[PDB]
Every structure is written in structure tokens, then in C-alpha cells.
GROMACS .gro file of N, CA, C and O in nm:
model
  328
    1UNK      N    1   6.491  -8.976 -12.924
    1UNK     CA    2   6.539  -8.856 -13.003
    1UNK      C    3   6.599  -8.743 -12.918
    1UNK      O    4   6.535  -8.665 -12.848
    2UNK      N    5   6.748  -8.746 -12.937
    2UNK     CA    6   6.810  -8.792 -12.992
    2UNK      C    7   6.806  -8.757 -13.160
    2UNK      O    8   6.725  -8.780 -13.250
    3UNK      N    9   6.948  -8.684 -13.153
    3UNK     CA   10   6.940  -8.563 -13.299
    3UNK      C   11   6.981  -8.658 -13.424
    3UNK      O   12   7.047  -8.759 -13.402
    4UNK      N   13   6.946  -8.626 -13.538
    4UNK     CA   14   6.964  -8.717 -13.663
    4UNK      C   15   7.078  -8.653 -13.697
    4UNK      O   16   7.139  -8.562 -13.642
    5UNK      N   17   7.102  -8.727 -13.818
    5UNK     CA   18   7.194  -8.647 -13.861
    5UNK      C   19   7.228  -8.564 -13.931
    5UNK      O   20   7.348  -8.536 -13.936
    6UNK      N   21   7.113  -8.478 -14.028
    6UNK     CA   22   7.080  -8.364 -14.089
    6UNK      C   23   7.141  -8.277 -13.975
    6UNK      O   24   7.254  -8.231 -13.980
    7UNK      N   25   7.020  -8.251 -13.828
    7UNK     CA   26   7.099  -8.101 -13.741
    7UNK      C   27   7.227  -8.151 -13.700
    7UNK      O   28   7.274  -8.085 -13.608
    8UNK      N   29   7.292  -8.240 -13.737
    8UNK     CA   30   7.446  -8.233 -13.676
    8UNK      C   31   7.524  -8.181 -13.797
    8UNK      O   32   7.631  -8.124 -13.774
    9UNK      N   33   7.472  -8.196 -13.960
    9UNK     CA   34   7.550  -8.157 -14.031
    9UNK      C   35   7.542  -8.024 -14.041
    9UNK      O   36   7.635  -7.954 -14.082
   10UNK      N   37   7.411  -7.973 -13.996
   10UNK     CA   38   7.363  -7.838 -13.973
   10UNK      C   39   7.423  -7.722 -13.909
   10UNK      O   40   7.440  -7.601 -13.922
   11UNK      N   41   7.446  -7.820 -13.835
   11UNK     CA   42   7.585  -7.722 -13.691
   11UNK      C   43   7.684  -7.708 -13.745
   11UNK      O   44   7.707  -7.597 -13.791
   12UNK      N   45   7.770  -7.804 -13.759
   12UNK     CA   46   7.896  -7.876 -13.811
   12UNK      C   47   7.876  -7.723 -13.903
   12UNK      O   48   7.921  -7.617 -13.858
   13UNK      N   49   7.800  -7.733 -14.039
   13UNK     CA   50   7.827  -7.618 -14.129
   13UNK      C   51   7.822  -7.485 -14.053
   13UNK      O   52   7.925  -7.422 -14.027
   14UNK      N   53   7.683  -7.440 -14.014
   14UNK     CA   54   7.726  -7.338 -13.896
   14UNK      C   55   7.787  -7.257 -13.867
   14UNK      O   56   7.793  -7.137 -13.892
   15UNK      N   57   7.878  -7.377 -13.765
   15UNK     CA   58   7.986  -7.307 -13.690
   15UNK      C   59   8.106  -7.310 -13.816
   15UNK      O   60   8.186  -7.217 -13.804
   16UNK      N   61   8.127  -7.388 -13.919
   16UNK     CA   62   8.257  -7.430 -14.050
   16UNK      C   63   8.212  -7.243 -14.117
   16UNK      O   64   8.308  -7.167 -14.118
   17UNK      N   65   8.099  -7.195 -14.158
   17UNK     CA   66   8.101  -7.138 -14.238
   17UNK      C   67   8.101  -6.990 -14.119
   17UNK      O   68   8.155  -6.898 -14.179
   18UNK      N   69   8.077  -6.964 -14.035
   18UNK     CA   70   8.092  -6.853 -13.920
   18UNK      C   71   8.245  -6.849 -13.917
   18UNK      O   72   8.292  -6.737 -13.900
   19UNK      N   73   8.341  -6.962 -13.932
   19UNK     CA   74   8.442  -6.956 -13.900
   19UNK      C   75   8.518  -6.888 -14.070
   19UNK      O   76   8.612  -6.809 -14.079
   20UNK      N   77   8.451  -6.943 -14.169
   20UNK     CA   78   8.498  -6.903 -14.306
   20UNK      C   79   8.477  -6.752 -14.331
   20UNK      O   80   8.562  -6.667 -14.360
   21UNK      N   81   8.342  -6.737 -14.311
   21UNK     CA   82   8.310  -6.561 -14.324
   21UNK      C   83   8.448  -6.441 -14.225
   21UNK      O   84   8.529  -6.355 -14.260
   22UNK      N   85   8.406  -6.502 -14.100
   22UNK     CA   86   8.510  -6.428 -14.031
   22UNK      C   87   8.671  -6.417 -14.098
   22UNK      O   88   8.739  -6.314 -14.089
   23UNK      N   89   8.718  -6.540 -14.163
   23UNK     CA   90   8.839  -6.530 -14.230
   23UNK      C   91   8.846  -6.459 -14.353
   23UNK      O   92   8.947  -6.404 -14.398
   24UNK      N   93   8.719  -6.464 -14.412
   24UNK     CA   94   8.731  -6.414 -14.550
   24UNK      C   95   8.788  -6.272 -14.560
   24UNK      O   96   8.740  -6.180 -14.495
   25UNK      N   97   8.891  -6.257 -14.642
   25UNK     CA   98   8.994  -6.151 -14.708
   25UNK      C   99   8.919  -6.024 -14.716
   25UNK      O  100   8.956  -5.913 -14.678
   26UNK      N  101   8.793  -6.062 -14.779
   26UNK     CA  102   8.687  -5.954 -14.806
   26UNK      C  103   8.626  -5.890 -14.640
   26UNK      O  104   8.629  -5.768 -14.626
   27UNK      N  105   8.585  -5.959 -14.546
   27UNK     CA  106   8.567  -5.910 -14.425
   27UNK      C  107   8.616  -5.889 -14.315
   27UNK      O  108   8.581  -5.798 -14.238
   28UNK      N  109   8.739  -6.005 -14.287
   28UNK     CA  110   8.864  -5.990 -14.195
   28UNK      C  111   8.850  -5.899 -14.121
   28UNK      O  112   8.815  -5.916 -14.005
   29UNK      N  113   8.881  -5.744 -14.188
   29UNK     CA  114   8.916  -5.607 -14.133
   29UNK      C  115   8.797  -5.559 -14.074
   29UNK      O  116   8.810  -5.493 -13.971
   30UNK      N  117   8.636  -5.587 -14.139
   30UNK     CA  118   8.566  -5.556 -14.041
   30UNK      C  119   8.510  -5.573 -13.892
   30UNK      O  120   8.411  -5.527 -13.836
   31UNK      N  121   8.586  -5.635 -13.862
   31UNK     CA  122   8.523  -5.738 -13.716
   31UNK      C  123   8.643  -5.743 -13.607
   31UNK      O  124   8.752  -5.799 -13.609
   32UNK      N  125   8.577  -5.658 -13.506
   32UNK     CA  126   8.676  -5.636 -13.415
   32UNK      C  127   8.754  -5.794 -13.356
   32UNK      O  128   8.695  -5.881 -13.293
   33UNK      N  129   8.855  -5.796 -13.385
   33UNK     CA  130   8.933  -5.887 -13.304
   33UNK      C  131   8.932  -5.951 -13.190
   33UNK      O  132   8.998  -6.052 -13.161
   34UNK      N  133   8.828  -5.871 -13.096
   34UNK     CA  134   8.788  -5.947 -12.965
   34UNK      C  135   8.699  -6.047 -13.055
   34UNK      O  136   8.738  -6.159 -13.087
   35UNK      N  137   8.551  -5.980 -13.101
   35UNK     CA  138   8.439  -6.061 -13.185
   35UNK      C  139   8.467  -6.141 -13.203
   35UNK      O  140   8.425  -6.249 -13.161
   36UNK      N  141   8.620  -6.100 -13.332
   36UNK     CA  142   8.676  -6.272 -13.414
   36UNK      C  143   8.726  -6.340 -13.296
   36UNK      O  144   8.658  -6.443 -13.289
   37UNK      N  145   8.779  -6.338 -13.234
   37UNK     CA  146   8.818  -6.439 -13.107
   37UNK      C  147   8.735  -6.538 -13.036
   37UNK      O  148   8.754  -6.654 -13.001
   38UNK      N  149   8.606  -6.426 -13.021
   38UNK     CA  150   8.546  -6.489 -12.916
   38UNK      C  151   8.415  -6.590 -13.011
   38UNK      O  152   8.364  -6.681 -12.944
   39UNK      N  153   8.363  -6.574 -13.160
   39UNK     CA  154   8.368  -6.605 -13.282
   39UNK      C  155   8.415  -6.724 -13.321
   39UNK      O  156   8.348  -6.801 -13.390
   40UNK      N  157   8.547  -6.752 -13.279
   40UNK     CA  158   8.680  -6.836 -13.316
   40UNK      C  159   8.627  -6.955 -13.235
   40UNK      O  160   8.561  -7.052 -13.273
   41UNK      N  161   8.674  -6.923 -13.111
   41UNK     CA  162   8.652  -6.986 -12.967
   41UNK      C  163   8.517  -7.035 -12.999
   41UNK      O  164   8.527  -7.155 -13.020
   42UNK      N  165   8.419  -7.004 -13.011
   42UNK     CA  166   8.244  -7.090 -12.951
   42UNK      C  167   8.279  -7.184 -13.117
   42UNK      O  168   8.230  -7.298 -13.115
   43UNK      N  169   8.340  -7.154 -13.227
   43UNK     CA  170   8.309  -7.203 -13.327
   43UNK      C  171   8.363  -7.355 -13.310
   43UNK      O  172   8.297  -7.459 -13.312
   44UNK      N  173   8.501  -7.335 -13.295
   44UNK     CA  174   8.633  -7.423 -13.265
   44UNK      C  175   8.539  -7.546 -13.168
   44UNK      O  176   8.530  -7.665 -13.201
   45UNK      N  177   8.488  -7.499 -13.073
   45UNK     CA  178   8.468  -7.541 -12.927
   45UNK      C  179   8.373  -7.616 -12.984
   45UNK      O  180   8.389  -7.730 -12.939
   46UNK      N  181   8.281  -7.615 -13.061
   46UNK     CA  182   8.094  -7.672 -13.113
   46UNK      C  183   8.158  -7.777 -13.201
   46UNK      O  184   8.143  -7.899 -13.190
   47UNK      N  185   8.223  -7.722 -13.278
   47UNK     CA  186   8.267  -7.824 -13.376
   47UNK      C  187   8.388  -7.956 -13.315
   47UNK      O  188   8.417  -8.055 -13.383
   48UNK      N  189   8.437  -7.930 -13.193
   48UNK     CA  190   8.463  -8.028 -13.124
   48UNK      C  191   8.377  -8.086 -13.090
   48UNK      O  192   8.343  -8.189 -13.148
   49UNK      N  193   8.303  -8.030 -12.967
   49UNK     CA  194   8.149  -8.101 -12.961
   49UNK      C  195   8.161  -8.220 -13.032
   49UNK      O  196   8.220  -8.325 -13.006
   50UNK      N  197   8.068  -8.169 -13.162
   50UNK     CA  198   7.983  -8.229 -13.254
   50UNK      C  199   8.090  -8.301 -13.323
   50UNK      O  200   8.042  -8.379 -13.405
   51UNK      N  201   8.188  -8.302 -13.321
   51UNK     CA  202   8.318  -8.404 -13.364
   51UNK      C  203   8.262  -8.529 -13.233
   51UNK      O  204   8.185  -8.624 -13.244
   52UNK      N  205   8.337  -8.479 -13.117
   52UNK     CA  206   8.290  -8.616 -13.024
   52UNK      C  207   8.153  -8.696 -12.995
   52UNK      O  208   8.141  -8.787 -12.913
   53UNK      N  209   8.039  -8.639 -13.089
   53UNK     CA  210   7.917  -8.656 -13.058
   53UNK      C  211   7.811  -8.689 -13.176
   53UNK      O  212   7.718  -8.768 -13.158
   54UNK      N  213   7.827  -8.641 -13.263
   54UNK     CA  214   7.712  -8.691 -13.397
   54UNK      C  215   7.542  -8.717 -13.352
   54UNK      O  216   7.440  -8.715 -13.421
   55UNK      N  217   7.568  -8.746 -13.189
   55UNK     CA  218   7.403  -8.803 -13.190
   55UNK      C  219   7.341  -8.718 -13.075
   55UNK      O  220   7.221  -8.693 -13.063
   56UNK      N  221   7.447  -8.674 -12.987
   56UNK     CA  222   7.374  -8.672 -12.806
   56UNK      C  223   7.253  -8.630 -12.817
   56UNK      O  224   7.223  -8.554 -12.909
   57UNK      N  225   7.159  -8.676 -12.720
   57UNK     CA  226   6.993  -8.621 -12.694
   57UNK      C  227   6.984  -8.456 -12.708
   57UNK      O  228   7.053  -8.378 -12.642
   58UNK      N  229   6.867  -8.414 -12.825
   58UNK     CA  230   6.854  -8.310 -12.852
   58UNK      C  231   6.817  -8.206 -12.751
   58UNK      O  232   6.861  -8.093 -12.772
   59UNK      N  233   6.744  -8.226 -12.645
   59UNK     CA  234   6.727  -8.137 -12.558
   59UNK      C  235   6.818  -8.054 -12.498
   59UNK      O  236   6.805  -8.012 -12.383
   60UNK      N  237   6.938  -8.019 -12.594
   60UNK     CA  238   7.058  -7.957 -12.535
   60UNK      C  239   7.162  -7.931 -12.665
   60UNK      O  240   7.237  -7.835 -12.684
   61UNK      N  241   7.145  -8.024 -12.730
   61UNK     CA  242   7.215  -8.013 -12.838
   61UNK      C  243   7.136  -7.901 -12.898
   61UNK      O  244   7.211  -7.861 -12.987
   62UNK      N  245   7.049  -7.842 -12.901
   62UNK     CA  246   6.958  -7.727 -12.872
   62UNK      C  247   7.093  -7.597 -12.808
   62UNK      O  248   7.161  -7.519 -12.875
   63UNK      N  249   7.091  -7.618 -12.672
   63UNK     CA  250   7.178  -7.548 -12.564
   63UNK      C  251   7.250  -7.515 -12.706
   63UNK      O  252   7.216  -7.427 -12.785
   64UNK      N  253   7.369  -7.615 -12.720
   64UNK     CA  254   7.471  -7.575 -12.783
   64UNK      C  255   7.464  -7.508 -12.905
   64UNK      O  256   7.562  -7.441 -12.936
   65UNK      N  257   7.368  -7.512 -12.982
   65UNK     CA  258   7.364  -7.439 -13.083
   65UNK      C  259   7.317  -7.283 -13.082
   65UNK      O  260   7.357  -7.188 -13.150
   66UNK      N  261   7.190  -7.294 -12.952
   66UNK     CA  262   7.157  -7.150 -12.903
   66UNK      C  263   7.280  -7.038 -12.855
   66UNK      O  264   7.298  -6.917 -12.869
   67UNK      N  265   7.352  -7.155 -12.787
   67UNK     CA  266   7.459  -7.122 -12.738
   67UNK      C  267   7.561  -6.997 -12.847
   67UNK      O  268   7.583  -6.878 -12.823
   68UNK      N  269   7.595  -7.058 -12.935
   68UNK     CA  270   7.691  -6.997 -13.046
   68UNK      C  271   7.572  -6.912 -13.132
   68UNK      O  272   7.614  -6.829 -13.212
   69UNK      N  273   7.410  -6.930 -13.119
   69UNK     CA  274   7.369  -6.836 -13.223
   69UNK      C  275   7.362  -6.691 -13.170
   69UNK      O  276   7.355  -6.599 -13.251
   70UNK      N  277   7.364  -6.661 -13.004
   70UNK     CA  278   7.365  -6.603 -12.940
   70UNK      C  279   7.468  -6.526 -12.937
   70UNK      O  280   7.447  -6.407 -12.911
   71UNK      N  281   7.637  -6.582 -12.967
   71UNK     CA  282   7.723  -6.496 -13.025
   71UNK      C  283   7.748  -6.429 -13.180
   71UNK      O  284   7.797  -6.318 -13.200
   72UNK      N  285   7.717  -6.498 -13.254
   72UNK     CA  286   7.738  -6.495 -13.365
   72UNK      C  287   7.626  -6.390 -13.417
   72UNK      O  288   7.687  -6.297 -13.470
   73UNK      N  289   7.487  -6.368 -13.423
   73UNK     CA  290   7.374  -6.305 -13.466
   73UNK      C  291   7.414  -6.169 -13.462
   73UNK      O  292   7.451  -6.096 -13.554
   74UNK      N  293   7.399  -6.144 -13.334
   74UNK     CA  294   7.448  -5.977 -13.320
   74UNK      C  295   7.601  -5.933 -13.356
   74UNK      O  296   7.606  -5.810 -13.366
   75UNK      N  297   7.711  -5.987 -13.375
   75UNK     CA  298   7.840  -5.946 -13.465
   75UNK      C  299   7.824  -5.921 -13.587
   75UNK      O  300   7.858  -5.820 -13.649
   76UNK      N  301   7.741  -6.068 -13.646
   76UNK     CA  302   7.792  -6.047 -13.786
   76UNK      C  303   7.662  -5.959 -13.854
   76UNK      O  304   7.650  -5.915 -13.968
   77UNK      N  305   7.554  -5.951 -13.718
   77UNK     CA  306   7.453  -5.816 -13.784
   77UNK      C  307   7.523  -5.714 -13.785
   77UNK      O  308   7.533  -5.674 -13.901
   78UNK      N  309   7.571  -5.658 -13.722
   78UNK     CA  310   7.687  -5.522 -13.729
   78UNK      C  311   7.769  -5.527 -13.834
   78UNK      O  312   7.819  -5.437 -13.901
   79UNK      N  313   7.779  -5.677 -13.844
   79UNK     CA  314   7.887  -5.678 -13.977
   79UNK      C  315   7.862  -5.631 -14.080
   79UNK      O  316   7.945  -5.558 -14.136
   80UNK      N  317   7.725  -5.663 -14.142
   80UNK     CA  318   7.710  -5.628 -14.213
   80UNK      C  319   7.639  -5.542 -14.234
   80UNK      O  320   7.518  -5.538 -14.261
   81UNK      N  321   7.763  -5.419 -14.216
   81UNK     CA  322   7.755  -5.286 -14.259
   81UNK      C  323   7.848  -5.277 -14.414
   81UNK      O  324   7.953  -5.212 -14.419
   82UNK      N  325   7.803  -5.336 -14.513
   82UNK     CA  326   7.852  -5.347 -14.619
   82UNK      C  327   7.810  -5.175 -14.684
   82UNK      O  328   7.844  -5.142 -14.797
   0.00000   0.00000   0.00000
């Protein structure tokens, strides 16, 4: 073990719906443009990943997800300054 395939669809959504929020019409304007970039970039990048990979040993596939929650948490907490 070696990840199933629930946390790969897990990610996969994730990083799909981090990438949707940031586009959405409704929030776009709030989120500084570096954020969305750098946002863009770890999202784009994971979901390659997990495109070339579906299974690799979890002890890292861990990494990668810590990886992007580590960007994403603190932006879109600011974000939502609704």
C-alpha cells in the first residue's frame, strides 16, 4: 500500500475543483494573481502527477498532496472574505 483508488480520485478532485473556484466569475477578482498563478501551477502540476500515476506508494503521495494543501489553505482562507 500503495494508494487505492478513492485518494487518487480525491486529489484528482482537489486540485480539479481549487482550479474551478479560482476561475469562478464570482471569485476571479478576489485573488491576487500571483496566488492564482502559483494556485494554477501546484494544481496543473498534481493533476499531471496523478494523470501519470493512479497508484504510486502512499508514503509520498501524502508529500504531494501536503504539498498543494500547504498552498491552497491559507489563499483561499483569505479568500474567503465574502
Amino acid at each position: 500500500g500503495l494508494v487505492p483508488r478513492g485518494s487518487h480520485m480525491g486529489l484528482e478532485s482537489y486540485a480539479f475543483n481549487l482550479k474551478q473556484t479560482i476561475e469562478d466569475e464570482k471569485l476571479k477578482d478576489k485573488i491576487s494573481p500571483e496566488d492564482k498563478k502559483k494556485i494554477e501551477d501546484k494544481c496543473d502540476e498534481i493533476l499531471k502527477w496523478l494523470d501519470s500515476n493512479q497508484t504510486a506508494e502512499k508514503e509520498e503521495f501524502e508529500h504531494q498532496q501536503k504539498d498543494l494543501e500547504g498552498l491552497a489553505n491559507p489563499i483561499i482562507s483569505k479568500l474567503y472574505q465574502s
